[PDB]
Design a protein around this ligand. Structure first.
Ligand SMILES: OC[C@H]1O[C@H](O[C@H]2[C@H](O)[C@@H](O)[C@@H](O)O[C@@H]2CO)[C@H](O)[C@@H](O)[C@@H]1O
Ligand SMILES: [Zn+2]
Ligand SMILES: [Zn+2]
Length: 539
């Protein structure tokens, strides 16, 4: 459910959202369409969750690596601009947004990590990585540190891991081989072991995240840090005499940062699909719109040929553009979400000592191709599970979350038609059988019944129409059709609130002929109620 005549924009909270709002306010002052820009927490995981249900924003902003898994799930609307529009951007920026030979987003700016050093504490920056442990002990005796950067996200650590030979998926003959993963080779191990050696020798702290590393550098407590173009203005507010230069070398090899291309996607369920096309083309992809976002938090090396040449002489942009040449462009295959999750748990568990470097990377090697390891992005509905597994519904082997018995063909169908969400235990998808579902639905009515109300009253108190409220069957949990909801209104039968959920009775459960028995099948102690709420969508 997305409004008409209105565009909602989502962007990362560190990419300068207030600058994009200025571009939107001029779009509303000229076109009359109120464009709202927001920045949700973890929008790269929250977007596919809410885009699958046809909801979400109209415009999604992120690097190109996540856009492949979106459009593959049918979440991104394809884009076909004009014959003269593709010419004002660099051609390699469109390559990063081309999935299955079709454009899926609007390329904006090219991102790449760089070294950020304090010129007062550190006159000349270190050229290599190995010369930092000795440099830290010099600053340690003065009360400061050498380096502090975000260790909780693998994007900042990847340049060191890819330095001696680590890679994501082998790229050859124009295709990425998801079978050949290079996160556990000698190059990857050497890069991560050197990072853990910095933690063991107490040169860095594994607890350091983006804010801690940023607050410690902007206060003057660390000599240098690793970040992107978005953090330049945050140091400009402080009086830190900083410098942006090339990344240090590891084993004499250049660091290989994963080059990110910030892109703009349009939700396939957005009614204003062409209203959002002319906005990005005529208001963001102009020289003034990019400057407003760059004044807030810098975008790096933008793709627009016009405005890029103006600030191409930037000593910070030149260093970012050089780090991008020695790195490599991020793949846009759908497996990138599972890859980043495997490396993130590999780096964190290796930094904290939860497991050795070999153990973390070996687990990451197998988890890079897995599907259910990432709890955020995971098949929630049955058709998503079958499409992800590439197996039909009758070949699925789903056990009940309660009794661990395998569902039959008809129960798998019932699970999908009832709009039940897949439940995961030990990273394994589960469903629910007919016996367990109708039992705990009645146990829930016996224990967590709150109140009942007429459908006419329910509208006036939620100030929403009855066909917009999700009402499930009190006995079989099937979502009531608009015709079944109108059934309660005409017959003057109240709806029932069980545990905060509103329920009614569908066509099949309206009578329940006498020949049937009351439900008694099962194959504080409220844990069954929490499991049921997972099956219905965690409120
Ligand atoms: O760390 C995994 C993460 O890496 C990148 O995320 C970057 C984002 O791309 C950068 O532009 C910047 O925002 O920092 C993020 C790291 O926290 C990839 O862009 C993203 O696909 C991936 O999840
Ligand atoms: Zn069961
Ligand atoms: Zn029913």
């Amino acid at each position: 459910k997305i409004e008409e005549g209105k565009l909602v924009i989502w962007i990362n909270g560190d990419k300068g959202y207030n600058g994009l709002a200025e571009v939107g306010k001029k779009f509303e002052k000229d076109t009359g369409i109120k464009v709202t820009v927001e920045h949700p927490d973890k929008l790269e995981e929250k977007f596919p969750q809410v885009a699958a249900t046809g909801d979400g924003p109209d415009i999604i902003f992120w690097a190109h690596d996540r856009f492949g898994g979106y459009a593959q799930s049918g979440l991104l609307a394809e884009i076909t601009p004009a014959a003269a529009f593709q010419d004002k951007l660099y051609p390699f920026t469109w390559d990063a947004v081309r999935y299955n030979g079709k454009l899926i987003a609007y390329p904006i700016a090219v991102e790449a990590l760089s070294l950020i050093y304090n010129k007062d504490l550190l006159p000349n920056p270190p050229k290599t990585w190995e010369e930092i442990p000795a440099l830290d002990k010099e600053l340690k005796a003065k009360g400061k540190s050498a380096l502090m950067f975000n260790l909780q996200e693998p994007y900042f650590t990847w340049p060191l891991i890819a330095a001696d030979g680590g890679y994501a998926f082998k790229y050859e003959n124009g295709k990425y081989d998801i079978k050949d993963v290079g996160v556990d080779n000698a190059g990857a191990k050497a890069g991560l072991t050197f990072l853990v050696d910095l933690i063991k020798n107490k040169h860095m702290n594994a607890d350091t995240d983006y804010s801690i590393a940023e607050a410690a550098f902007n206060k003057g407590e660390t000599a240098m840090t690793i970040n992107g173009p978005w953090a330049w203005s945050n140091i400009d507010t402080s009086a830190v005499n900083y410098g942006v230069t090339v990344l240090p070398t590891f084993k004499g090899q250049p660091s290989k940062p994963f080059v990110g291309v910030l892109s703009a996607g349009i939700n396939a369920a957005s009614p204003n699909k062409e209203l959002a096309k002319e906005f990005l083309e005529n208001y963001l992809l102009t020289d003034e719109g990019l400057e407003a976002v760059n004044k807030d938090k810098p975008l790096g090396a933008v793709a627009l040929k016009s405005y890029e040449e103006e600030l191409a002489k930037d000593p910070r942009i030149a260093a970012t553009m050089e780090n991008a040449q020695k790195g490599e462009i991020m793949p846009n295959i759908p497996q990138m979400s599972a890859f980043w999750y495997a490396v993130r748990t590999a780096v964190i568990n290796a930094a904290s000592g939860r497991q050795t470097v070999d153990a973390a990377l070996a687990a990451a090697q197998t988890n890079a191709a897995a599907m259910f390891k990432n709890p955020a992005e995971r098949p929630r509905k049955l058709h998503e599970l079958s499409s992800a597994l590439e197996i039909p519904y009758d070949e699925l082997r789903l056990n009940c979350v309660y009794c661990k018995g395998q569902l039959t063909e008809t129960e798998v169908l019932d699970f999908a038609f009832t709009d039940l969400t897949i439940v995961y235990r030990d990273d394994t998808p589960h469903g629910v059988c007919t016996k367990c579902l109708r039992f705990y639905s009645k146990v829930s009515e016996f224990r967590w019944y709150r109140y009942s109300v007429y459908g006419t009253t329910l509208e006036k108190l939620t100030n929403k129409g009855i066909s917009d409220l999700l009402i499930r069957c009190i006995t079989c949990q099937r979502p009531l059709s608009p015709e079944e909801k109108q059934r309660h209104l005409d017959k003057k039968k109240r709806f029932h609130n069980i545990g905060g959920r509103w329920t009614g009775r569908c066509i099949a459960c309206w009578r329940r002929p006498r020949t049937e028995t009351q439900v008694g099948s099962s194959g504080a102690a409220e844990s069954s109620e929490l499991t049921l709420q997972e099956l219905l969508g965690e409120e």
